[PDB]
Scaffold this active site. Structure first.
Site, short mmCIF file in Angstrom:
data_model
loop_
_atom_site.label_atom_id
_atom_site.label_comp_id
_atom_site.label_asym_id
_atom_site.label_seq_id
_atom_site.Cartn_x
_atom_site.Cartn_y
_atom_site.Cartn_z
N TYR A 81 0.76 -1.24 0.00
CA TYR A 81 0.00 0.00 0.00
C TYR A 81 0.80 1.30 0.00
CZ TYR A 81 -3.38 -3.57 1.32
OH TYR A 81 -4.13 -4.72 1.29
N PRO A 94 -11.23 -0.48 -1.30
CA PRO A 94 -12.40 -1.25 -1.69
C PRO A 94 -13.71 -0.51 -1.46
CG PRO A 94 -10.84 -2.58 -0.44
CD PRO A 94 -10.52 -1.14 -0.19
N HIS A 317 -7.59 0.84 2.28
CA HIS A 317 -7.05 -0.51 2.50
C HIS A 317 -5.81 -0.69 3.37
CE1 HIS A 317 -7.31 -4.69 1.89
NE2 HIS A 317 -7.63 -4.71 0.61
N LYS A 393 -24.38 -20.94 -0.02
CA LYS A 393 -23.55 -21.94 0.63
C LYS A 393 -24.32 -23.22 0.85
CE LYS A 393 -23.00 -19.30 4.18
NZ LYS A 393 -22.51 -18.87 5.53
N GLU A 399 -23.61 -31.01 -0.40
CA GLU A 399 -22.78 -31.95 -1.14
C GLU A 399 -21.50 -32.30 -0.39
OE1 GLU A 399 -23.11 -33.60 -4.19
OE2 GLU A 399 -25.23 -33.06 -3.93
N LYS A 400 -21.36 -31.76 0.82
CA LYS A 400 -20.17 -31.99 1.64
C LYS A 400 -18.98 -31.37 0.94
CE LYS A 400 -22.37 -34.13 4.79
NZ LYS A 400 -22.66 -33.35 6.04
N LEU A 401 -19.16 -30.14 0.46
CA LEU A 401 -18.08 -29.44 -0.23
C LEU A 401 -17.96 -28.03 0.31
CD1 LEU A 401 -18.86 -30.40 -3.94
CD2 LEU A 401 -17.09 -31.41 -2.48
N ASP A 404 -16.65 -21.92 -0.49
CA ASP A 404 -15.65 -21.06 -1.09
C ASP A 404 -14.87 -21.79 -2.17
OD1 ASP A 404 -14.26 -18.40 -1.03
OD2 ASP A 404 -12.53 -19.71 -0.68
N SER A 528 -11.39 -12.34 -3.73
CA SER A 528 -11.48 -12.41 -2.28
C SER A 528 -12.91 -12.67 -1.88
CB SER A 528 -11.01 -11.10 -1.62
OG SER A 528 -12.00 -10.10 -1.73
N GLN A 529 -13.08 -13.17 -0.66
CA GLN A 529 -14.39 -13.44 -0.13
C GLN A 529 -14.53 -12.58 1.11
OE1 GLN A 529 -15.82 -16.25 2.72
NE2 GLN A 529 -16.32 -17.67 1.06
C1 LIG Z 1 -10.51 -18.55 2.58
C2 LIG Z 1 -11.62 -18.32 3.62
C3 LIG Z 1 -12.60 -17.26 3.09
C4 LIG Z 1 -12.39 -19.63 3.84
O1 LIG Z 1 -13.46 -19.41 4.76
P1 LIG Z 1 -14.41 -20.60 5.19
O2 LIG Z 1 -15.34 -20.10 6.23
O3 LIG Z 1 -13.55 -21.77 5.52
O4 LIG Z 1 -15.24 -20.87 3.82
P2 LIG Z 1 -15.95 -22.29 3.50
O5 LIG Z 1 -16.72 -22.12 2.25
O6 LIG Z 1 -14.94 -23.37 3.56
O7 LIG Z 1 -16.98 -22.45 4.72
C5 LIG Z 1 -18.23 -21.75 4.68
C6 LIG Z 1 -19.35 -22.57 5.37
O8 LIG Z 1 -19.41 -23.89 4.73
C7 LIG Z 1 -19.04 -24.91 5.72
N1 LIG Z 1 -18.27 -26.04 5.12
C8 LIG Z 1 -17.01 -25.99 4.67
N2 LIG Z 1 -16.69 -27.18 4.14
C9 LIG Z 1 -17.74 -27.98 4.26
C10 LIG Z 1 -18.01 -29.29 3.87
N3 LIG Z 1 -17.09 -30.01 3.25
N4 LIG Z 1 -19.22 -29.83 4.14
C11 LIG Z 1 -20.18 -29.10 4.73
N5 LIG Z 1 -19.95 -27.84 5.11
C12 LIG Z 1 -18.76 -27.25 4.86
C13 LIG Z 1 -18.27 -24.16 6.78
O9 LIG Z 1 -18.40 -24.86 8.04
C14 LIG Z 1 -19.02 -22.86 6.84
O10 LIG Z 1 -20.24 -23.06 7.56
P3 LIG Z 1 -21.15 -21.81 7.98
O11 LIG Z 1 -22.05 -21.47 6.84
O12 LIG Z 1 -22.06 -22.40 9.17
O13 LIG Z 1 -20.26 -20.76 8.52
C15 LIG Z 1 -11.03 -17.88 4.98
O14 LIG Z 1 -10.17 -18.90 5.49
C16 LIG Z 1 -10.25 -16.57 4.86
O15 LIG Z 1 -9.04 -16.56 4.64
N6 LIG Z 1 -11.00 -15.48 4.99
C17 LIG Z 1 -10.45 -14.12 4.91
C18 LIG Z 1 -10.56 -13.58 3.47
C19 LIG Z 1 -10.26 -12.08 3.46
O16 LIG Z 1 -9.29 -11.63 4.07
N7 LIG Z 1 -11.13 -11.35 2.76
C20 LIG Z 1 -11.05 -9.87 2.64
C21 LIG Z 1 -9.85 -9.43 1.81
S1 LIG Z 1 -9.66 -7.62 1.78
C1 LIG Z 2 -8.38 -6.81 -3.56
N1 LIG Z 2 -7.12 -7.55 -3.41
C2 LIG Z 2 -7.40 -8.99 -3.39
C3 LIG Z 2 -6.25 -7.25 -4.54
C4 LIG Z 2 -6.45 -7.14 -2.16
C5 LIG Z 2 -7.11 -7.78 -0.93
O1 LIG Z 2 -8.31 -7.05 -0.62
C6 LIG Z 2 -6.16 -7.64 0.26
C7 LIG Z 2 -5.14 -8.76 0.33
O2 LIG Z 2 -5.45 -9.88 -0.12
O3 LIG Z 2 -4.01 -8.50 0.83
#
Ligand SMILES: CC(C)(COP(=O)(O)OP(=O)(O)OC[C@H]1O[C@@H](n2cnc3c(N)ncnc32)[C@H](O)[C@@H]1OP(=O)(O)O)[C@@H](O)C(=O)NCCC(=O)NCCS
Ligand SMILES: C[N+](C)(C)C[C@H](O)CC(=O)O
Length: 599
Positions: A81, A94, A317, A393, A399-401, A404, A528-529
């Protein structure tokens, strides 16, 4: 944050050298040729040999970790940054679109604004008292330092690099916010003498005075200066504050807890593009003729309240990532839905101070230049907002998946269907389980994702086979994710080795000048999520001229998507990418439903 909490959090580790290089080679396979991979493979071997260059750099990183709270912190903040000279607008800060409110007149707009302001002060009370609830991710406590960077802070233009000021814990913390209306800023105190916060009704009263004190846009949009190039803004800024009054105005803005932008009515556009325009309003302001001048992009937290009920925000940011920001959003929104208690009488309040600006020919010229620059940026931004209502979601989970991973794999399929090849893909991973942790990189383009996208479009492969490939791709992505949040990814590590080389004053290792690395770091897909309880969505511009900026909020029954692209690149189209993404998500659901696992 609370020292006690932070002290118990583990410190950011340095992944094993041979381990990160191994993961690097594997992540390269799907995005580089055999010739380039074979070349990189040799560089890596040499780089990691005993008594070699890589080993010496690794040793250095490990020494850095033993003498700092976080070996990556400052390096990341600076290279990501502070040393990023492009405008923060679109390219860095953002944008966020919150659920449209129901107010139908001025009283309502201010009514919600007053409520929103109060909701921020309520959340702020947990910060000042360090009573903010602890968060978890991989089942581990999370760093809360970001929460103490968002309020009463502001970025500052620097000739070489920018800086950040934080007054939250200053001798006499700021008790005022800034309100912008028709390009005019006002210093609004949100706390009483005794030290208690003003009520929603009280803030409302003040907002009325502020509004009637700026009924016309006859004032130069000085704030638009903050959207120019960091180098240009640095110089224009240095000139601007040469006036006593001007400097006093800037100082107030910089110290304010946060800024609220009361935007004006915008040209009623077609519904098929409404959401996209609202996204632009929140990201850049629409333009110099609209609300772009009714901002101050250096400010960390900017809340926007449109005249048509629309609202959102844009944040600087450098202070933090999305999660901390949305947690604040969820609290505020949920607060704006609190039934107004017994309305009590409120004694007269002081007139909000007007932060005047003395315009000169030079400043005027700087403003106009800022307008031209911003106009170019806007005309080159292609945004497409997509609300995936089909499901959220819920299906992936049934589907146990991992939702994200399901979504990321879908994105890989969409891209491959359009370009017939995989590409360097970046997905934000939170490193907050570590003290002062920010982010690391998850690479969605992998060996398994490529095998899936290929087999998926292969009309010679049994659907039963595509299913296996799909699940394996999803699992591979979940495995990468688990490693990333635990500090086992490699992108930040490799960056650290590069910066370490520079610091050691040794020649830049070939591995970093290798074509494969250039390709690996050129993210055509930057994603990103940002989960949230509020039905909101975030967006940002692509990180490369020929790439896309994709962000999403995975809800239970739907997913809020955002897709950005640059018009300067004919090979990219926001609407198209979004359409393919939507179709990819559905095809994957169709594929999985056609072949149930349970018997
Ligand atoms: C990568 C990241 C987003 C993953 O998050 P996560 O919560 O593990 O995402 P998932 O899709 O795996 O899980 C989401 C949901 O599905 C569920 N799930 C995951 N795998 C599953 C599976 N195989 N079967 C059934 N449920 C599952 C999780 O338990 C969770 O349940 P919820 O709805 O009750 O909370 C997280 O680790 C991360 O890094 N987040 C930060 C991102 C960030 O910084 N964003 C802003 C950038 S500026
Ligand atoms: C938008 N993007 C993914 C480029 C930057 C993220 O928000 C921050 C990061 O992942 O460090």
């Amino acid at each position: 944050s609370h020292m006690a909490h932070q002290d118990a959090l583990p410190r950011l580790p340095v992944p094993p050298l041979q381990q990160s290089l191994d993961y690097y080679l594997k992540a390269l396979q799907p995005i580089v040729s055999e010739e380039e991979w074979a070349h990189t493979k040799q560089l890596v071997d040499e780089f990691q040999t005993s008594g070699g260059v890589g080993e010496r750099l690794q040793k250095g990183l490990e020494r850095r970790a033993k003498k700092m709270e976080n070996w990556l912190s400052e390096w990341w903040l600076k290279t990501a940054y502070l040393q990023f000279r492009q405008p923060v607008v679109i390219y860095s800060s953002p944008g966020v679109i919150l659920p449209k409110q129901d107010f139908v007149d001025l009283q309502g707009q201010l009514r919600f604004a007053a409520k929103l302001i109060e909701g921020v002060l309520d959340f702020k009370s947990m910060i000042d008292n360090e009573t903010l609830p602890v968060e978890f991710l991989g089942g581990q406590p999370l760093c809360m330092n970001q929460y103490y960077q968002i309020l009463s802070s502001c970025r500052v233009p620097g000739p070489k690099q920018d800086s950040v000021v934080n007054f939250l814990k200053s001798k006499r913390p700021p008790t005022h916010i800034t309100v912008v209306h028709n390009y005019q800023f006002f210093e609004l105190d949100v706390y009483h003498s005794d030290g208690t916060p003003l009520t929603s009704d009280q803030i409302f009263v003040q907002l009325e005075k502020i509004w009637n004190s700026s009924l016309q846009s006859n004032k130069e949009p000085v704030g638009i200066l903050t959207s120019n190039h960091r180098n240009t803004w640095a110089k224009a800024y240095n000139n601007l504050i040469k006036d006593k009054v001007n400097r006093e105005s800037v100082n107030s803005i910089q110290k304010s807890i946060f800024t609220v932008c009361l935007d004006k009515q915008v040209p009623r556009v077609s519904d098929d593009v409404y959401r996209n325009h609202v996204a632009g309003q929140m990201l850049h302001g629409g333009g110099s003729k609209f609300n772009s001048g009714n901002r101050w992009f250096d400010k960390t937290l900017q809340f926007i309240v449109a005249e048509d009920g629309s609202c959102g925000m844009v944040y600087e940011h450098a202070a933090a990532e999305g999660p901390p920001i949305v947690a604040l959003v969820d609290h505020v929104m949920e607060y704006t839905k609190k039934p107004e208690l017994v309305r009590s009488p409120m004694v007269p309040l002081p007139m909000p101070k007007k932060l005047r600006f003395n315009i000169t020919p030079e400043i005027k010229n700087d403003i106009e230049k800022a307008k031209q620059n911003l106009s170019i940026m806007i005309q080159d931004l292609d945004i497409m907002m997509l609300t995936f209502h089909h499901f959220g979601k819920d299906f992936p989970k049934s589907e146990k998946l991992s939702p994200d991973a399901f979504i990321q794999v879908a994105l890989q399929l969409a891209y491959y269907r359009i370009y017939g090849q995989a590409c360097a893909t970046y997905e934000s991973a939170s490193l907050r389980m570590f003290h002062l942790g920010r982010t690391d990189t998850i690479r969605s383009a992998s060996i398994d994702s490529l095998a899936f996208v290929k087999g998926m479009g292969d009309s010679t492969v049994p659907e039963q086979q595509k299913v296996e490939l799909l699940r394996k791709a999803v699992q591979a992505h979940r495995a990468y994710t688990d490693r990333a949040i635990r500090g086992e990814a490699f992108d930040r590590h490799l960056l650290g080795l590069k910066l370490q080389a520079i610091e050691d004053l040794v020649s830049m290792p070939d591995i970093f000048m290798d074509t494969s690395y250039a390709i690996a770091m050129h993210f055509n897909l930057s994603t990103s999520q940002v989960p949230a309880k509020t039905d909101c969505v975030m967006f940002f511009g692509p990180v490369v001229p020929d790439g896309y900026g994709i962000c999403y909020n995975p809800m239970e029954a739907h997913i809020n998507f955002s897709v950005s692209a640059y018009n300067s690149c004919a090979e990219t189209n926001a609407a198209r990418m979004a359409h393919y993404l939507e179709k990819a998500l559905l095809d994957m659901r169709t594929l999985l439903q056609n072949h149930p696992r349970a018997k």
